[PDB]
Amino acid sequence: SFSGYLKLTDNVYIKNADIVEEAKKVKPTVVVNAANVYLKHGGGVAGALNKATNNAMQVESDDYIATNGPLKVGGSCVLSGHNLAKHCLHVVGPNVNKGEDIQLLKSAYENFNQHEVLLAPLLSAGIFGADPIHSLRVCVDTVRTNVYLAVFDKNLYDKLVSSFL
Ligand SMILES: CCc1c(C(=O)NC)[nH]c(C)c1C(C)=O
């Protein structure tokens, strides 16, 4: 199971880890991808997860989009986890670098409540432009299921833990 995590609350745990490496090690039931509405996994966590699947995640995602159309900002879809997890929950947090409503971050985290346990990144953090301290606060105030947060950057991980209220 998950190891080396710091417990933040009853159900939220955090670790300084590469989510790709964490997924390959644990093979969780659900890994969360920091997806965009088109499921175009170009960079950040999405590019890293997709590259770990040898692009199988992108091939599956393009078929999903061709059939269903784009996701909503704040929405999600469950696809295969490929070599990383049983499933991948592609969650679309608002991209503040695209001027998207930061208020949609709570709706994005609500998707996690449909899964008993998840390995996840902080939504809308990194290349999505939101404040990761704000993302962690929305996560602990929204997610009720067991979420194991992987934070890639050690310096950000320390800032998140040291400032956690
Ligand atoms: C492609 C770079 C990458 C990897 C990786 O390739 N791990 C094996 N994991 C992560 C989380 C990244 C990021 C944040 O972009």
PDB file of N, CA and C in Angstrom, residues 52-145:
ATOM      1  N   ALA A  52       4.456   7.709 -19.552  1.00  0.00           N
ATOM      2  CA  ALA A  52       4.674   6.436 -18.848  1.00  0.00           C
ATOM      3  C   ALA A  52       3.868   5.289 -19.453  1.00  0.00           C
ATOM      4  N   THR A  53       2.703   5.606 -20.051  1.00  0.00           N
ATOM      5  CA  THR A  53       1.884   4.598 -20.729  1.00  0.00           C
ATOM      6  C   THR A  53       2.321   4.366 -22.182  1.00  0.00           C
ATOM      7  N   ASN A  54       3.456   4.959 -22.626  1.00  0.00           N
ATOM      8  CA  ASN A  54       3.937   4.820 -23.997  1.00  0.00           C
ATOM      9  C   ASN A  54       2.867   5.357 -24.967  1.00  0.00           C
ATOM     10  N   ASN A  55       2.131   6.423 -24.569  1.00  0.00           N
ATOM     11  CA  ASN A  55       1.095   7.084 -25.364  1.00  0.00           C
ATOM     12  C   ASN A  55      -0.235   6.326 -25.445  1.00  0.00           C
ATOM     13  N   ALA A  56      -0.351   5.176 -24.768  1.00  0.00           N
ATOM     14  CA  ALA A  56      -1.616   4.419 -24.783  1.00  0.00           C
ATOM     15  C   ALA A  56      -2.736   5.244 -24.141  1.00  0.00           C
ATOM     16  N   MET A  57      -2.411   6.025 -23.105  1.00  0.00           N
ATOM     17  CA  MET A  57      -3.394   6.905 -22.498  1.00  0.00           C
ATOM     18  C   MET A  57      -3.940   7.934 -23.520  1.00  0.00           C
ATOM     19  N   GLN A  58      -3.065   8.525 -24.350  1.00  0.00           N
ATOM     20  CA  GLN A  58      -3.514   9.496 -25.356  1.00  0.00           C
ATOM     21  C   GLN A  58      -4.366   8.829 -26.446  1.00  0.00           C
ATOM     22  N   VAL A  59      -3.993   7.621 -26.873  1.00  0.00           N
ATOM     23  CA  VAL A  59      -4.760   6.910 -27.905  1.00  0.00           C
ATOM     24  C   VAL A  59      -6.178   6.601 -27.382  1.00  0.00           C
ATOM     25  N   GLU A  60      -6.240   6.133 -26.134  1.00  0.00           N
ATOM     26  CA  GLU A  60      -7.530   5.836 -25.533  1.00  0.00           C
ATOM     27  C   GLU A  60      -8.355   7.126 -25.357  1.00  0.00           C
ATOM     28  N   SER A  61      -7.711   8.209 -24.939  1.00  0.00           N
ATOM     29  CA  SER A  61      -8.348   9.502 -24.713  1.00  0.00           C
ATOM     30  C   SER A  61      -8.895  10.097 -25.997  1.00  0.00           C
ATOM     31  N   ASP A  62      -8.156   9.981 -27.114  1.00  0.00           N
ATOM     32  CA  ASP A  62      -8.635  10.517 -28.381  1.00  0.00           C
ATOM     33  C   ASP A  62      -9.888   9.782 -28.838  1.00  0.00           C
ATOM     34  N   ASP A  63      -9.947   8.454 -28.620  1.00  0.00           N
ATOM     35  CA  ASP A  63     -11.145   7.684 -28.950  1.00  0.00           C
ATOM     36  C   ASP A  63     -12.296   8.163 -28.038  1.00  0.00           C
ATOM     37  N   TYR A  64     -12.017   8.371 -26.734  1.00  0.00           N
ATOM     38  CA  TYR A  64     -13.057   8.844 -25.814  1.00  0.00           C
ATOM     39  C   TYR A  64     -13.620  10.212 -26.278  1.00  0.00           C
ATOM     40  N   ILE A  65     -12.741  11.140 -26.683  1.00  0.00           N
ATOM     41  CA  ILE A  65     -13.182  12.455 -27.119  1.00  0.00           C
ATOM     42  C   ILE A  65     -13.942  12.363 -28.439  1.00  0.00           C
ATOM     43  N   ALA A  66     -13.479  11.511 -29.357  1.00  0.00           N
ATOM     44  CA  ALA A  66     -14.185  11.349 -30.633  1.00  0.00           C
ATOM     45  C   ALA A  66     -15.634  10.861 -30.405  1.00  0.00           C
ATOM     46  N   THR A  67     -15.835  10.026 -29.387  1.00  0.00           N
ATOM     47  CA  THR A  67     -17.169   9.498 -29.097  1.00  0.00           C
ATOM     48  C   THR A  67     -18.012  10.443 -28.247  1.00  0.00           C
ATOM     49  N   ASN A  68     -17.389  11.069 -27.247  1.00  0.00           N
ATOM     50  CA  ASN A  68     -18.147  11.828 -26.240  1.00  0.00           C
ATOM     51  C   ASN A  68     -18.047  13.318 -26.263  1.00  0.00           C
ATOM     52  N   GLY A  69     -17.055  13.847 -26.967  1.00  0.00           N
ATOM     53  CA  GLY A  69     -16.819  15.281 -26.947  1.00  0.00           C
ATOM     54  C   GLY A  69     -16.017  15.635 -25.704  1.00  0.00           C
ATOM     55  N   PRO A  70     -15.701  16.920 -25.581  1.00  0.00           N
ATOM     56  CA  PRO A  70     -14.850  17.349 -24.464  1.00  0.00           C
ATOM     57  C   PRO A  70     -15.521  17.268 -23.106  1.00  0.00           C
ATOM     58  N   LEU A  71     -14.702  17.176 -22.068  1.00  0.00           N
ATOM     59  CA  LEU A  71     -15.206  17.194 -20.699  1.00  0.00           C
ATOM     60  C   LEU A  71     -15.565  18.657 -20.361  1.00  0.00           C
ATOM     61  N   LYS A  72     -16.183  18.877 -19.195  1.00  0.00           N
ATOM     62  CA  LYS A  72     -16.483  20.201 -18.721  1.00  0.00           C
ATOM     63  C   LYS A  72     -15.301  20.542 -17.795  1.00  0.00           C
ATOM     64  N   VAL A  73     -14.974  21.828 -17.634  1.00  0.00           N
ATOM     65  CA  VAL A  73     -14.006  22.243 -16.589  1.00  0.00           C
ATOM     66  C   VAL A  73     -14.724  21.946 -15.239  1.00  0.00           C
ATOM     67  N   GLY A  74     -14.059  21.212 -14.363  1.00  0.00           N
ATOM     68  CA  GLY A  74     -14.661  20.742 -13.111  1.00  0.00           C
ATOM     69  C   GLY A  74     -15.170  19.312 -13.207  1.00  0.00           C
ATOM     70  N   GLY A  75     -15.181  18.756 -14.419  1.00  0.00           N
ATOM     71  CA  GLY A  75     -15.673  17.414 -14.651  1.00  0.00           C
ATOM     72  C   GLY A  75     -14.596  16.369 -14.734  1.00  0.00           C
ATOM     73  N   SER A  76     -15.008  15.130 -14.965  1.00  0.00           N
ATOM     74  CA  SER A  76     -14.081  14.017 -15.009  1.00  0.00           C
ATOM     75  C   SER A  76     -14.604  12.879 -15.856  1.00  0.00           C
ATOM     76  N   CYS A  77     -13.718  11.952 -16.162  1.00  0.00           N
ATOM     77  CA  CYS A  77     -14.095  10.696 -16.755  1.00  0.00           C
ATOM     78  C   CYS A  77     -13.142   9.613 -16.251  1.00  0.00           C
ATOM     79  N   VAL A  78     -13.640   8.385 -16.170  1.00  0.00           N
ATOM     80  CA  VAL A  78     -12.852   7.245 -15.760  1.00  0.00           C
ATOM     81  C   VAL A  78     -12.405   6.486 -17.002  1.00  0.00           C
ATOM     82  N   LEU A  79     -11.114   6.370 -17.189  1.00  0.00           N
ATOM     83  CA  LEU A  79     -10.566   5.599 -18.282  1.00  0.00           C
ATOM     84  C   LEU A  79      -9.597   4.540 -17.680  1.00  0.00           C
ATOM     85  N   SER A  80      -8.904   3.773 -18.527  1.00  0.00           N
ATOM     86  CA  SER A  80      -7.973   2.773 -18.054  1.00  0.00           C
ATOM     87  C   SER A  80      -6.801   3.455 -17.362  1.00  0.00           C
ATOM     88  N   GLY A  81      -6.229   2.765 -16.401  1.00  0.00           N
ATOM     89  CA  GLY A  81      -5.008   3.235 -15.749  1.00  0.00           C
ATOM     90  C   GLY A  81      -3.773   2.676 -16.423  1.00  0.00           C
ATOM     91  N   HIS A  82      -3.961   1.844 -17.472  1.00  0.00           N
ATOM     92  CA  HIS A  82      -2.858   1.280 -18.250  1.00  0.00           C
ATOM     93  C   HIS A  82      -1.856   0.532 -17.313  1.00  0.00           C
ATOM     94  N   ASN A  83      -0.559   0.840 -17.401  1.00  0.00           N
ATOM     95  CA  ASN A  83       0.470   0.223 -16.570  1.00  0.00           C
ATOM     96  C   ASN A  83       0.660   0.942 -15.226  1.00  0.00           C
ATOM     97  N   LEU A  84      -0.176   1.956 -14.933  1.00  0.00           N
ATOM     98  CA  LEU A  84      -0.019   2.785 -13.751  1.00  0.00           C
ATOM     99  C   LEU A  84      -1.009   2.500 -12.649  1.00  0.00           C
ATOM    100  N   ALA A  85      -2.215   2.104 -13.009  1.00  0.00           N
ATOM    101  CA  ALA A  85      -3.305   1.925 -12.044  1.00  0.00           C
ATOM    102  C   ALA A  85      -4.411   1.057 -12.694  1.00  0.00           C
ATOM    103  N   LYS A  86      -5.425   0.607 -11.930  1.00  0.00           N
ATOM    104  CA  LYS A  86      -6.554  -0.094 -12.523  1.00  0.00           C
ATOM    105  C   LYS A  86      -7.303   0.930 -13.424  1.00  0.00           C
ATOM    106  N   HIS A  87      -7.547   2.133 -12.880  1.00  0.00           N
ATOM    107  CA  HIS A  87      -8.236   3.200 -13.585  1.00  0.00           C
ATOM    108  C   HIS A  87      -7.489   4.497 -13.476  1.00  0.00           C
ATOM    109  N   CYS A  88      -7.725   5.373 -14.438  1.00  0.00           N
ATOM    110  CA  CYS A  88      -7.271   6.733 -14.367  1.00  0.00           C
ATOM    111  C   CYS A  88      -8.505   7.602 -14.337  1.00  0.00           C
ATOM    112  N   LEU A  89      -8.619   8.421 -13.286  1.00  0.00           N
ATOM    113  CA  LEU A  89      -9.689   9.384 -13.197  1.00  0.00           C
ATOM    114  C   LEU A  89      -9.142  10.713 -13.740  1.00  0.00           C
ATOM    115  N   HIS A  90      -9.541  11.062 -14.956  1.00  0.00           N
ATOM    116  CA  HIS A  90      -9.114  12.296 -15.591  1.00  0.00           C
ATOM    117  C   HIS A  90      -9.974  13.403 -15.071  1.00  0.00           C
ATOM    118  N   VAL A  91      -9.400  14.276 -14.251  1.00  0.00           N
ATOM    119  CA  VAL A  91     -10.136  15.367 -13.655  1.00  0.00           C
ATOM    120  C   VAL A  91      -9.677  16.691 -14.217  1.00  0.00           C
ATOM    121  N   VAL A  92     -10.600  17.546 -14.640  1.00  0.00           N
ATOM    122  CA  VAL A  92     -10.287  18.859 -15.177  1.00  0.00           C
ATOM    123  C   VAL A  92     -10.442  19.938 -14.136  1.00  0.00           C
ATOM    124  N   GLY A  93      -9.328  20.385 -13.583  1.00  0.00           N
ATOM    125  CA  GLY A  93      -9.373  21.549 -12.716  1.00  0.00           C
ATOM    126  C   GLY A  93      -9.329  22.809 -13.584  1.00  0.00           C
ATOM    127  N   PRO A  94      -9.820  23.969 -13.098  1.00  0.00           N
ATOM    128  CA  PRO A  94      -9.676  25.206 -13.879  1.00  0.00           C
ATOM    129  C   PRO A  94      -8.203  25.576 -14.127  1.00  0.00           C
ATOM    130  N   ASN A  95      -7.914  26.005 -15.342  1.00  0.00           N
ATOM    131  CA  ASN A  95      -6.600  26.456 -15.705  1.00  0.00           C
ATOM    132  C   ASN A  95      -6.686  27.977 -15.606  1.00  0.00           C
ATOM    133  N   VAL A  96      -6.090  28.552 -14.552  1.00  0.00           N
ATOM    134  CA  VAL A  96      -6.125  30.011 -14.391  1.00  0.00           C
ATOM    135  C   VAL A  96      -5.274  30.698 -15.492  1.00  0.00           C
ATOM    136  N   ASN A  97      -4.305  29.979 -16.103  1.00  0.00           N
ATOM    137  CA  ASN A  97      -3.532  30.520 -17.237  1.00  0.00           C
ATOM    138  C   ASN A  97      -4.395  30.632 -18.537  1.00  0.00           C
ATOM    139  N   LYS A  98      -5.597  30.013 -18.559  1.00  0.00           N
ATOM    140  CA  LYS A  98      -6.608  30.130 -19.622  1.00  0.00           C
ATOM    141  C   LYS A  98      -7.809  30.988 -19.123  1.00  0.00           C
ATOM    142  N   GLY A  99      -7.627  31.761 -18.053  1.00  0.00           N
ATOM    143  CA  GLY A  99      -8.680  32.562 -17.450  1.00  0.00           C
ATOM    144  C   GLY A  99      -9.921  31.803 -17.010  1.00  0.00           C
ATOM    145  N   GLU A 100      -9.770  30.534 -16.562  1.00  0.00           N
ATOM    146  CA  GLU A 100     -10.925  29.738 -16.121  1.00  0.00           C
ATOM    147  C   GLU A 100     -11.282  29.973 -14.657  1.00  0.00           C
ATOM    148  N   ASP A 101     -12.572  29.871 -14.316  1.00  0.00           N
ATOM    149  CA  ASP A 101     -13.069  30.150 -12.968  1.00  0.00           C
ATOM    150  C   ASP A 101     -12.425  29.274 -11.868  1.00  0.00           C
ATOM    151  N   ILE A 102     -11.621  29.923 -10.976  1.00  0.00           N
ATOM    152  CA  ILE A 102     -10.997  29.250  -9.839  1.00  0.00           C
ATOM    153  C   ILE A 102     -12.036  28.598  -8.929  1.00  0.00           C
ATOM    154  N   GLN A 103     -13.281  29.116  -8.921  1.00  0.00           N
ATOM    155  CA  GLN A 103     -14.373  28.538  -8.156  1.00  0.00           C
ATOM    156  C   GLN A 103     -14.708  27.113  -8.576  1.00  0.00           C
ATOM    157  N   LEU A 104     -14.334  26.695  -9.811  1.00  0.00           N
ATOM    158  CA  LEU A 104     -14.546  25.334 -10.303  1.00  0.00           C
ATOM    159  C   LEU A 104     -13.606  24.295  -9.685  1.00  0.00           C
ATOM    160  N   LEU A 105     -12.603  24.738  -8.881  1.00  0.00           N
ATOM    161  CA  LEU A 105     -11.693  23.796  -8.273  1.00  0.00           C
ATOM    162  C   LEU A 105     -12.433  22.896  -7.278  1.00  0.00           C
ATOM    163  N   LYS A 106     -13.435  23.434  -6.536  1.00  0.00           N
ATOM    164  CA  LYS A 106     -14.178  22.583  -5.606  1.00  0.00           C
ATOM    165  C   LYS A 106     -14.967  21.520  -6.379  1.00  0.00           C
ATOM    166  N   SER A 107     -15.628  21.918  -7.492  1.00  0.00           N
ATOM    167  CA  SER A 107     -16.340  20.962  -8.342  1.00  0.00           C
ATOM    168  C   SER A 107     -15.398  19.878  -8.875  1.00  0.00           C
ATOM    169  N   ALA A 108     -14.177  20.279  -9.263  1.00  0.00           N
ATOM    170  CA  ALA A 108     -13.191  19.325  -9.741  1.00  0.00           C
ATOM    171  C   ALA A 108     -12.834  18.296  -8.654  1.00  0.00           C
ATOM    172  N   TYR A 109     -12.586  18.775  -7.405  1.00  0.00           N
ATOM    173  CA  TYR A 109     -12.264  17.855  -6.320  1.00  0.00           C
ATOM    174  C   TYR A 109     -13.437  16.950  -5.939  1.00  0.00           C
ATOM    175  N   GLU A 110     -14.686  17.410  -6.151  1.00  0.00           N
ATOM    176  CA  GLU A 110     -15.843  16.565  -5.826  1.00  0.00           C
ATOM    177  C   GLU A 110     -15.845  15.248  -6.587  1.00  0.00           C
ATOM    178  N   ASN A 111     -15.192  15.218  -7.780  1.00  0.00           N
ATOM    179  CA  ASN A 111     -15.084  13.963  -8.511  1.00  0.00           C
ATOM    180  C   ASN A 111     -14.370  12.876  -7.714  1.00  0.00           C
ATOM    181  N   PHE A 112     -13.414  13.280  -6.837  1.00  0.00           N
ATOM    182  CA  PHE A 112     -12.657  12.306  -6.055  1.00  0.00           C
ATOM    183  C   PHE A 112     -13.570  11.512  -5.089  1.00  0.00           C
ATOM    184  N   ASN A 113     -14.699  12.122  -4.681  1.00  0.00           N
ATOM    185  CA  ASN A 113     -15.615  11.476  -3.745  1.00  0.00           C
ATOM    186  C   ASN A 113     -16.331  10.253  -4.287  1.00  0.00           C
ATOM    187  N   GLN A 114     -16.234  10.012  -5.609  1.00  0.00           N
ATOM    188  CA  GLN A 114     -16.810   8.810  -6.194  1.00  0.00           C
ATOM    189  C   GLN A 114     -15.871   7.588  -6.091  1.00  0.00           C
ATOM    190  N   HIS A 115     -14.666   7.754  -5.479  1.00  0.00           N
ATOM    191  CA  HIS A 115     -13.688   6.686  -5.393  1.00  0.00           C
ATOM    192  C   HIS A 115     -13.212   6.599  -3.957  1.00  0.00           C
ATOM    193  N   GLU A 116     -13.204   5.393  -3.386  1.00  0.00           N
ATOM    194  CA  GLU A 116     -12.828   5.192  -1.988  1.00  0.00           C
ATOM    195  C   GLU A 116     -11.389   5.576  -1.675  1.00  0.00           C
ATOM    196  N   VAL A 117     -10.466   5.327  -2.601  1.00  0.00           N
ATOM    197  CA  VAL A 117      -9.076   5.689  -2.402  1.00  0.00           C
ATOM    198  C   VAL A 117      -8.441   6.097  -3.725  1.00  0.00           C
ATOM    199  N   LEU A 118      -7.648   7.178  -3.699  1.00  0.00           N
ATOM    200  CA  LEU A 118      -7.018   7.663  -4.932  1.00  0.00           C
ATOM    201  C   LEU A 118      -5.608   8.113  -4.672  1.00  0.00           C
ATOM    202  N   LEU A 119      -4.761   7.964  -5.686  1.00  0.00           N
ATOM    203  CA  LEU A 119      -3.436   8.570  -5.759  1.00  0.00           C
ATOM    204  C   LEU A 119      -3.664   9.806  -6.650  1.00  0.00           C
ATOM    205  N   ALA A 120      -3.287  11.012  -6.220  1.00  0.00           N
ATOM    206  CA  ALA A 120      -3.610  12.202  -6.984  1.00  0.00           C
ATOM    207  C   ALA A 120      -2.602  13.292  -6.908  1.00  0.00           C
ATOM    208  N   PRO A 121      -2.584  14.176  -7.914  1.00  0.00           N
ATOM    209  CA  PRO A 121      -1.821  15.410  -7.782  1.00  0.00           C
ATOM    210  C   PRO A 121      -2.756  16.514  -7.217  1.00  0.00           C
ATOM    211  N   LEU A 122      -2.194  17.683  -6.848  1.00  0.00           N
ATOM    212  CA  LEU A 122      -2.999  18.832  -6.470  1.00  0.00           C
ATOM    213  C   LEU A 122      -3.604  19.408  -7.741  1.00  0.00           C
ATOM    214  N   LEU A 123      -4.938  19.475  -7.808  1.00  0.00           N
ATOM    215  CA  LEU A 123      -5.600  19.979  -9.005  1.00  0.00           C
ATOM    216  C   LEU A 123      -5.346  21.453  -9.215  1.00  0.00           C
ATOM    217  N   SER A 124      -5.234  21.867 -10.490  1.00  0.00           N
ATOM    218  CA  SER A 124      -5.003  23.237 -10.921  1.00  0.00           C
ATOM    219  C   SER A 124      -3.641  23.789 -10.491  1.00  0.00           C
ATOM    220  N   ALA A 125      -2.781  22.977  -9.882  1.00  0.00           N
ATOM    221  CA  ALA A 125      -1.442  23.408  -9.474  1.00  0.00           C
ATOM    222  C   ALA A 125      -0.493  23.260 -10.720  1.00  0.00           C
ATOM    223  N   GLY A 126       0.770  23.620 -10.558  1.00  0.00           N
ATOM    224  CA  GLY A 126       1.730  23.499 -11.640  1.00  0.00           C
ATOM    225  C   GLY A 126       1.368  24.367 -12.813  1.00  0.00           C
ATOM    226  N   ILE A 127       1.429  23.766 -14.017  1.00  0.00           N
ATOM    227  CA  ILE A 127       1.176  24.507 -15.239  1.00  0.00           C
ATOM    228  C   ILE A 127      -0.274  25.006 -15.368  1.00  0.00           C
ATOM    229  N   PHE A 128      -1.203  24.566 -14.475  1.00  0.00           N
ATOM    230  CA  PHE A 128      -2.572  25.095 -14.475  1.00  0.00           C
ATOM    231  C   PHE A 128      -2.687  26.478 -13.803  1.00  0.00           C
ATOM    232  N   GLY A 129      -1.619  26.926 -13.146  1.00  0.00           N
ATOM    233  CA  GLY A 129      -1.552  28.286 -12.649  1.00  0.00           C
ATOM    234  C   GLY A 129      -2.154  28.671 -11.322  1.00  0.00           C
ATOM    235  N   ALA A 130      -2.869  27.765 -10.657  1.00  0.00           N
ATOM    236  CA  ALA A 130      -3.483  28.135  -9.375  1.00  0.00           C
ATOM    237  C   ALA A 130      -2.455  28.021  -8.248  1.00  0.00           C
ATOM    238  N   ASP A 131      -2.769  28.636  -7.103  1.00  0.00           N
ATOM    239  CA  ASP A 131      -1.921  28.566  -5.933  1.00  0.00           C
ATOM    240  C   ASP A 131      -2.066  27.166  -5.348  1.00  0.00           C
ATOM    241  N   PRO A 132      -0.976  26.388  -5.276  1.00  0.00           N
ATOM    242  CA  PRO A 132      -1.078  25.033  -4.709  1.00  0.00           C
ATOM    243  C   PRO A 132      -1.520  25.002  -3.236  1.00  0.00           C
ATOM    244  N   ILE A 133      -1.207  26.053  -2.456  1.00  0.00           N
ATOM    245  CA  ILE A 133      -1.670  26.118  -1.062  1.00  0.00           C
ATOM    246  C   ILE A 133      -3.217  26.197  -1.052  1.00  0.00           C
ATOM    247  N   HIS A 134      -3.783  26.987  -1.976  1.00  0.00           N
ATOM    248  CA  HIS A 134      -5.232  27.085  -2.117  1.00  0.00           C
ATOM    249  C   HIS A 134      -5.794  25.712  -2.579  1.00  0.00           C
ATOM    250  N   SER A 135      -5.131  25.059  -3.556  1.00  0.00           N
ATOM    251  CA  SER A 135      -5.579  23.741  -4.022  1.00  0.00           C
ATOM    252  C   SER A 135      -5.630  22.696  -2.897  1.00  0.00           C
ATOM    253  N   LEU A 136      -4.607  22.672  -2.033  1.00  0.00           N
ATOM    254  CA  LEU A 136      -4.592  21.730  -0.920  1.00  0.00           C
ATOM    255  C   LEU A 136      -5.736  22.007   0.065  1.00  0.00           C
ATOM    256  N   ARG A 137      -6.040  23.271   0.301  1.00  0.00           N
ATOM    257  CA  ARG A 137      -7.105  23.681   1.223  1.00  0.00           C
ATOM    258  C   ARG A 137      -8.445  23.225   0.647  1.00  0.00           C
ATOM    259  N   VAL A 138      -8.664  23.464  -0.655  1.00  0.00           N
ATOM    260  CA  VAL A 138      -9.909  23.003  -1.299  1.00  0.00           C
ATOM    261  C   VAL A 138      -9.992  21.477  -1.263  1.00  0.00           C
ATOM    262  N   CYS A 139      -8.878  20.783  -1.504  1.00  0.00           N
ATOM    263  CA  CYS A 139      -8.845  19.334  -1.415  1.00  0.00           C
ATOM    264  C   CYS A 139      -9.299  18.829  -0.025  1.00  0.00           C
ATOM    265  N   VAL A 140      -8.662  19.319   1.060  1.00  0.00           N
ATOM    266  CA  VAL A 140      -9.022  18.820   2.392  1.00  0.00           C
ATOM    267  C   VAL A 140     -10.452  19.221   2.787  1.00  0.00           C
ATOM    268  N   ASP A 141     -10.959  20.363   2.283  1.00  0.00           N
ATOM    269  CA  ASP A 141     -12.326  20.791   2.597  1.00  0.00           C
ATOM    270  C   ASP A 141     -13.391  20.189   1.667  1.00  0.00           C
ATOM    271  N   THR A 142     -12.985  19.437   0.628  1.00  0.00           N
ATOM    272  CA  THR A 142     -13.966  18.903  -0.339  1.00  0.00           C
ATOM    273  C   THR A 142     -13.961  17.393  -0.403  1.00  0.00           C
ATOM    274  N   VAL A 143     -12.773  16.794  -0.449  1.00  0.00           N
ATOM    275  CA  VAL A 143     -12.634  15.357  -0.565  1.00  0.00           C
ATOM    276  C   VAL A 143     -12.857  14.686   0.784  1.00  0.00           C
ATOM    277  N   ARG A 144     -13.755  13.711   0.799  1.00  0.00           N
ATOM    278  CA  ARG A 144     -14.067  12.921   1.990  1.00  0.00           C
ATOM    279  C   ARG A 144     -13.506  11.504   1.914  1.00  0.00           C
ATOM    280  N   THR A 145     -13.159  11.042   0.696  1.00  0.00           N
ATOM    281  CA  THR A 145     -12.558   9.741   0.516  1.00  0.00           C
ATOM    282  C   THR A 145     -11.028   9.829   0.763  1.00  0.00           C
TER     283      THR A 145
END
